[PDB]
């Protein structure tokens with residue numbers, strides 16, 4: 232778009248290319264996403280301009296022109312997936328893991344309180360700066376509307392065909408990102424929907440009417456599912472301490488109504504000692 236110079240490709244979202252760009256007039260460096268225009272998307276997108284929070288990538292402008300769609304976001308210099316790969320040897324220090332988790336829960340508590348879900352959290356859409364900050368990106372783009380879209384962070388109620396699912400889905404994804412930071416291995420690396428479901432089952436137990444009332448009446452649930460026993464958390468995320476493990480377990484509750492909200496998670500004793508360390512990033 233005329234007011235922008237593409238400096239470089241910085242990714243491919245679900246929804247079209249993402250460019251680093253410079254505003255020919257303002258000077259500002261920005262993230263420019265080209266989508267791919269029904270008035271429904273126009274409307275939802277416009278709502279997002281308003282939901283501002285220090286832990287949500289700022290949506291600067293929504294250009295709808297020549298009947299094409301661009302979103303202009305504030306620019307961050309790295310994503311969490313790259314940072315994680317970069318920190319493979321040593322792992323991310325716990326106090327930095329805890330800060331990141333804490334800030335993301337703040338962003339989610341904000342979104343959820345305005346009834347906006349993300350619905351597709353993944354380390355690739357979590358963006359970080361040199362000053363210790365981490366921000367949710369791509370917020371709202373999913374209601375509004377190639378490699379495999381990853382299933383690794385998908386809540387099981389989504390996998391079981393629930394069509395009217397809740398903010399608890401973001402809580403689930405965030406718990407899977409939490410474990411992956413601690414262990415340096417993805418929690419549930421599914422390569423199909425059944426494989427994804429069965430990986431969850433194998434770690435957490437096949438859910439039943441005891442732990443998830445109503446589970447058996449779900450669209451894609453079958454009685455013929457195997458019955459695996461639940462594994463112990465101490466085996467799942469060493470060397471996370473007992474507070475971190477308690478929290479994670481609550482974020483990974485099967486029953487979306489049992490699953491901890493972002494707001495009550497902020498109160499958990501794991502965060503009693505939270506700080507804001509600054510990462511070392513080599514841009």
Ligand SMILES: O=C(Nc1c[nH]nc1C(=O)Nc1ccc(F)cc1)c1ccccc1
Nearest residue numbers: 241244262304305306307308309310356368
């Ligand atoms: O809004 C998105 N990204 C961004 C917004 N502001 N900065 C970015 C961004 O990707 N920055 C970035 C990330 C990794 C790099 F190596 C260098 C720079 C987005 C859109 C679709 C899918 C994923 C992320």
